[PDB]
Design a protein around this ligand. Structure first.
Ligand SMILES: Fc1ccccc1CNc1cn[nH]c1
Length: 191
């Protein structure tokens, strides 16, 4: 998770879609959903990203409705956004044991216990954090079984992007889990 602000320049698809849902948190605007194969995915927007500006308007104080309204009205030949990278998240690097474990239990995406003497304990993995990404792959919406598969079919070094449950809960609110399982970009990023 960069400590970095960055500009992205977007262009609507032939359907006038960018593939984004925004959500208002603590008088910021945060990315609730990046759609697979969208402009939003292509410029590299991620779950949990803060939108500081849209076309050089500050987003501070907007409803999620006003954020979505603004998007709709943009002469969207070209859309500029100032992004703060995933401010509510942190990345932890672990190494599997010979048993092939990093050493935690999760339920519905959320870490619930740390196993003693483990790489998770050594790196201070916290419980009551939801798992947002795994080796830069968004895994939000996926079943527990599929998350477990991605951890199985990884190298010895594992990278996990976590977010405090209470913050995760407040972001995803008013999004059908199915839509996030169905449409939340779970792809490895293009180059
Ligand atoms: F499984 C769920 C149950 C309720 C809301 C969302 C999900 C998606 N799964 C998830 C959560 N954190 N990471 C992955």
């Amino acid at each position: 998770i960069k400590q970095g602000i960055r500009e992205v320049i977007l262009c609507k698809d032939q359907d006038g879609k960018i593939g984004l849902r925004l959500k208002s948190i603590d008088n910021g605007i945060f990315v609730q959903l990046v759609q697979a194969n969208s402009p939003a995915s292509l410029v590299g927007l991620r779950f949990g990203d803060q939108v500081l500006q849209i076309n050089g308007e500050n987003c501070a104080g907007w409803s999620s409705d006003k954020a979505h309204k603004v998007l709709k009205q943009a002469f969207g030949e070209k859309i500029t956004m100032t992004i703060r990278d995933r401010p509510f998240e942190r990345t932890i690097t672990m190494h599997k044991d010979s048993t092939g474990h990093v050493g935690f239990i999760f339920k519905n995406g959320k870490i619930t216990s740390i196993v003693k003497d483990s790489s998770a304990a050594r790196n201070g993995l916290l419980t009551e954090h939801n798992i947002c990404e795994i080796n830069g792959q968004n895994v939000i919406g996926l079943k527990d079984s599929q998350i477990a598969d991605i951890l199985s079919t990884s190298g010895t070094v594992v990278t996990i992007t976590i977010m405090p449950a209470f913050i995760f809960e407040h972001i995803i609110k008013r999004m059908a889990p199915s839509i996030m399982k169905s449409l939340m970009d779970h792809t490895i990023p293009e180059v």
